[PDB]
Amino acid sequence: DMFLYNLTLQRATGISFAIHGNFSGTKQQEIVVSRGKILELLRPDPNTGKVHTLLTVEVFGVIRSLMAFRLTGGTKDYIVVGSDSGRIVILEYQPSKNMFEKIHQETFGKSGCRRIVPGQFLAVDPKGRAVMISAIEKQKLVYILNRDAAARLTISSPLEAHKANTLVYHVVGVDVGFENPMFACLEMDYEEADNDPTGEAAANTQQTLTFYELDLGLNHVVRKYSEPLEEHGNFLITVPGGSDGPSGVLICSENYITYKNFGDQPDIRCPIPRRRNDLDDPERGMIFVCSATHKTKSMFFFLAQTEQGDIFKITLETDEDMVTEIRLKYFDTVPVAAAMCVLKTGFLFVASEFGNHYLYQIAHLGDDDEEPEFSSAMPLEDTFFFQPRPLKNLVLVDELDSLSPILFCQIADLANEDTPQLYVACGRGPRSSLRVLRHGLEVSEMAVSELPGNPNAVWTVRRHIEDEFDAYIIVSFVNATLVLSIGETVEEVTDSGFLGTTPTLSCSLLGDDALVQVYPDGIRHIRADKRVNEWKTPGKKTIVKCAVNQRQVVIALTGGELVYFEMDPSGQLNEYTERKEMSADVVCMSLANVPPGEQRSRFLAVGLVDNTVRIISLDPSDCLQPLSMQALPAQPESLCIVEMFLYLNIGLQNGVLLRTVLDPVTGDLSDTRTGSRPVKLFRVRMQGQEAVLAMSSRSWLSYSYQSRFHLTPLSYETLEFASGFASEQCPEGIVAISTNTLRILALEKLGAVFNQVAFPLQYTPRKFVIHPESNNLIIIETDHNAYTEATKAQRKQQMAEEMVEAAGELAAEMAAAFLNENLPESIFGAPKAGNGQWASVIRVMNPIQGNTLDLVQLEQNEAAFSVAVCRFSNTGEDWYVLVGVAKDLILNPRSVAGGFVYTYKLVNNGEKLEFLHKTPVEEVPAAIAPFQGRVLIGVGKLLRVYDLGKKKLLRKCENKHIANYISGIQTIGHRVIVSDVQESFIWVRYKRNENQLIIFADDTYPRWVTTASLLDYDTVAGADKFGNICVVRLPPNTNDEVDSQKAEVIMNYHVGETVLSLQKTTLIPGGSESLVYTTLSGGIGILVPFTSHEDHDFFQHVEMHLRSEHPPLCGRDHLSFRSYYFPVKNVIDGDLCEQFNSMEPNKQKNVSEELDRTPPEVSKKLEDIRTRYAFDYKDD
């Protein structure tokens, strides 16, 4: 038996919908976004300009439409949600409870994203009196919205607006001044097209803009108006009517925009302006992808973005009650957005269709400048032209990191740390990237300055005790120490500091204004009044270790000889009249800070080569006297006494760290392994309290939170030293030095999440492999409708040559500006052209830094879809890089001219690719796998065993009984698992005697596989194009000699987001194996096995209870949702279970008492799963 448990770690980051309004019922405007399966409420701050996520809720359904409305005289906006349920839901956000309250939910149809069941389209009357939900075809429903005496919104019965054999491109409510509600929509009748064997009825069948009217007095809906359009349009825009502007709709169409208000209003059209000298194929059209609308009591305007990301400001001139002209004007350029929101106080929210999201501030409305303003009345026949310029009307204020779309992922420990990182190949075209993910605390790099030599230490010292900010940063190297004054320019200083040439063991502010340096050859004291008191080391000895304080200085000399200095209130230091020797040498010391009231701290921790730590009193009553010793499992590396009670932290030579309680004696303790690196301990200031920073393979932070400790690692690389920092530039940060680098960092965010570092790419990545020796990455980046750099260059040059042909002699100057400037493709989009064109690039990149080691630009129409790095049995230990490529791939309709397989030498330990040979093949090979000293390559439906030759790759075996097409292949040591594009997995054995691939098993169900992974020698876990995940297992007693084995399915589960990477791995050291998956919406999830049947029954009953006491927000049935395509088999939805903490307390009491438990017990048992398989940073 294998029962699983699903959990989400990083929720989906891509945005499918976005609306704005006063959802909190205040003057503040919020933004409700739909990430597909998750509804989210965000609040952009008009002060700091950051977007904060107020609420995030899993709806357990497919959100297909999102609208907000407001009743007359209302002060708060509701939320209408069209889902994959057969229900419409109206929700209201509650700030006092921070939850969406389901105000209404009315049922009308069946579940699923059906063809004739409404839910796909949603348009509301701009006065809030009625809402219309409609399907893609035929069925359309309208509900009447009216509040009662208690001011609570009430819904009516559905009014039918069906029209058989009619397709709906888009629905939009028309702003009429409190007249009968009007819903305009684009329709297309296919009844004639379905009855004409010539196909002529298919053509000349143009879409009709139709106006539906809701007769409020007669309580029925009638197809009031209908007129055919000139060319097909993609979406509509509500033109504000009534008192503000003229009523009507803006129909967006390929290369045109048409205001077509009905009545005596004449159709007004304007062509879509095109950029000057488009590198795109002129045969391709141009449409708008989205539109925002801003309505003011004074004016109004629109913002319409093109496929290239061109935002235009559309204004309408009006006379009497009719419109005169459509005035477009080039506003700016942002990435291609799925939705835009224009908020008051000047802010534009751009939710990109892929990649990171953006929040800009509107500096200028777009006018008052000297840019050309186009009008519909301008005659031309030819379109308008404009010059794409950098951002001059907007300013980037915030950027939300979104991982969508995640195409490949490898969870491995490529860095020096212990916890594995998530190396994620993800992005969209030119904005693609390889991002490294570490789950910890976000680190804001305030500054980075490289240091010569190898620095080993660093401190930060104030100039006065009353100074709110520090004054000096000291860095100790091998033979020298350096002082920096953190003024306005953080420049190197020499005179104010004195110190010396020799390495420094400590730098502290001893007096109110006196500085003290401890170096191996002695102690230097620097008074504020520049008088230096120098203390030489007695005899030939040197100072091994030290421990400073606000009024105490203890040093440990060779042979373990302690020397104690205490400052008198007059200011000088006085050495004690006795020096104590230890049982062995001293390796580390710590001395607690003095309380504000007292004049000296009592306890002194001293670590010995005895592998023991000892507490020594410093009060004059028992000065330098043993108080309590303690043995340790290894030699200590650092000590740190800290308050919150008193705790002694001990970091050993191995990676173990210990927290102990002490007062007159040492008490009990708890320990944990951090190992791989010796643990160092530093004092840091966090949230106005004292926290401890322990450094090993990772930098962990231990801090108390409401008498409850936390030990959270930093999402950052290895560090070597650190000390607390505080300046006006960074009020509360940390100065840390790593190998040959000095860094000023800050820990602003307190919550632990998946933090990233992004390495930009050029094209959309398909796959990357791990080089075992070099630990580097070989990534293939392939994109459709693209030019390669060479081809782009030839078309730009050729376009200059065509450009000179005009009689004119400014053509050479225009060609100077044009050729000189290659616009950045990351922001202004990448030139796209050709239905058969492609662009593929092989890249060798180091995962430690962002540097690309090698670059291989492929030919024009070559498209790589597979890659691998392996050795060959016939050759030596030389690494080879095979890359599967396709020649002249045309999709829709699928037709391929050829395919290739490049072979590379990968010399200089994985740093450069040397061309070997290029073996051609008939069909595209989208699968390459190392297999028993040779390489399995899947060309088309043919799985072939390939060996290396000096001229070409020799075909050693072939199997052509595969159904459709090979998408991927993975092999255990003996067997071969192949992923058919449509017909699930197949099980093949390779007979070594005859080189024969015998198919010995397949699946009973068809599965549109996307990726998979071998859980063991018998079972395989696979993903689905439709967002499902399954585990299929062979019969237990089987051998590869038998044939036609039906593989039984032991797990089915609909995730709801398309999965593209499954990987069995351990997330943290000491935890258990989990099945981590990534998704196409930028989300990271895990599947977790149960350890006993008792837990299975427990979480299962939790699931059943919450399915009824906490039903999905958008009317969907949870059990049906997870059984979207296949019934659920042995999976418990942990995302639903963790909503136990969000229910009402009475429901928690009922569900808990039904399990004979208490709510806190249920919550802890839910946290146990994350503690065992994910990230838990609680420290008792």
Partner: protein
Amino acid sequence: QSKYIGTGHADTTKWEWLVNQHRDSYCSYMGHFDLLNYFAIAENESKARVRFNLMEKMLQPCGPP
């Protein structure tokens, strides 16, 4: 059942069946977000243009009978 679009009978041609499942498929592409994402990634086109082509395909997904 006759009033439910997509339902079939004994005298239902293969063209009617596959145009029914073709239109159903295109509508499902419109619905499920990540499916439209996969398609918009394969062919380097924005989501809006992919949905537009999927709507133009609704007139005659296969061909005349």
